[PDB]
């Protein structure tokens, strides 16, 4: 599924991501924009052989099982495929564990490089929330 901007903002709010760990909803929408362009089916292979999955490009190195990432963990206790669902529940629950891990949203390199410090409220501007 390719979400609309406000449609994803509303879905993230419904699933309790708005101000989760102090990160306003625009931060989450911005990260999703640059990680996946709002596409739940986004996948990207890393040089190290891990894969990133879903709207927030969650990595098989630590967070999900894909059966093909040697030495990896599955700290969200999910198949990485669950992160590709039209239903964002698995991505949101796993992102809450990631952003709690100590470095906040810096875990998302595209958030650090493209969202951090910017006017992230622009990403929810106009949305009925
Ligand atoms: Na894994």
Briefly, what is this?
By secondary structure, the chain is mostly helical.
Write the layout of secondary structure elements.
Blueprint: H1 5-14, H2 25-36, E1 43-45, E2 51-53, E3 58-59, H3 89-99, H4 109-114
Antiparallel strand pairs: 1-2, 2-3
Subunit structure: Monomer.
Disulfide bonds: 6-127, 30-115, 64-80, 76-94
Subcellular location: Secreted
Description:
It is a single chain. With 129 residues, the protein is mainly alpha-helical. The protein has one domain: Orthogonal Bundle (Lysozyme), CATH 1.10.530. It has four helices and three strands. Strands 1-2-3 form a three-stranded antiparallel β-sheet. A hairpin with a 4-residue loop joins strand 2 and strand 3. Helix 1 packs across helix 2. The chain is globular and about 45 Å long. The two termini are 21 Å apart. Sodium ion (NA) binds next to loops.
What is the CATH C-level name? Answer: Mainly Alpha
What Rg, in angstroms, do the CA atoms define?
14 Å
**CATH T-level topology:** Lysozyme
Strand content: 5-15%
Head-to-tail CA distance between termini: 21 Å
Largest β sheet strand count, sense and barrel closure:
3 strands, antiparallel
Class per helix and strand makeup:
mainly alpha
> How many structural domains does the protein architecture include?
1
Helix share, percent: 25-40%
Give helix and strand order, one letter per element, not per position.
HHEEEHH
CATH architecture name: Orthogonal Bundle
Which overall shape is indicated by the principal axes computed on the Cα atoms? globular
């Amino acid at each position: 599924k390719v979400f609309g901007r406000c449609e994803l903002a509303a879905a993230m709010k419904r699933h309790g991501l708005d101000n989760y760990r102090g990160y306003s909803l625009g931060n989450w929408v911005c990260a999703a924009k640059f990680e996946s362009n709002f596409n739940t089916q986004a996948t990207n292979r890393n040089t190290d052989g891990s894969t990133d999955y879903g709207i927030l490009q969650i990595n098989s190195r630590w967070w999900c099982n894909d059966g093909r990432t040697p030495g990896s963990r599955n700290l969200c206790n999910i198949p990485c495929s669950a992160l590709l669902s039209s239903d964002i529940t698995a991505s949101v629950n796993c992102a809450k564990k990631i952003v709690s891990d100590g470095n906040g949203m810096n875990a998302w390199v595209a958030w650090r490089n493209r969202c951090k410090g910017t006017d992230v409220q622009a990403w929810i501007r106009g949305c009925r929330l």
